[PDB]
């Protein structure tokens, strides 16, 4: 897309990146916990068991 290949567009994203990662992280924790994904849960220091 022509408009999205932009300098400020890039700046905006860079500024937006950290927040995005946080959201994925939240979802990740949720998936692991909600679906009891045990491959990841088993490594947790305390909730193991």
């Amino acid at each position: 897309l022509s408009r999205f290949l932009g300098p400020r567009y890039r700046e905006l994203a860079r500024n937006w990146i950290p927040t995005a990662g946080m959201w994925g992280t939240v979802g990740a924790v949720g998936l692991v916990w909600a679906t009891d994904w045990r491959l990841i849960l088993d490594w947790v220091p305390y909730i193991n068991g």
């Binding site: 927040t19 946080m22 959201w23 992280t25 939240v26 924790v29 949720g30 692991v32 916990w33 849960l41 947790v44 305390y46 909730i47 068991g49």
Partner: protein, 41 residues
């Protein structure tokens, strides 16, 4: 005050703290609750 500024002010982090806490809460709640039920019966 530090916590608010760190994990409770940014909504993304708010969610992170909630999810992570919930992930562990179950472990604690189940464990604690079971102890009680067993003691009762």
């Amino acid at each position: 005050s530090r916590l608010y500024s760190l994990l409770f002010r940014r909504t993304s982090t708010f969610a992170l703290t909630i999810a992570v806490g919930a992930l562990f809460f179950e472990r604690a709640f189940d464990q604690g609750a079971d102890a009680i039920y067993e003691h009762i019966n």
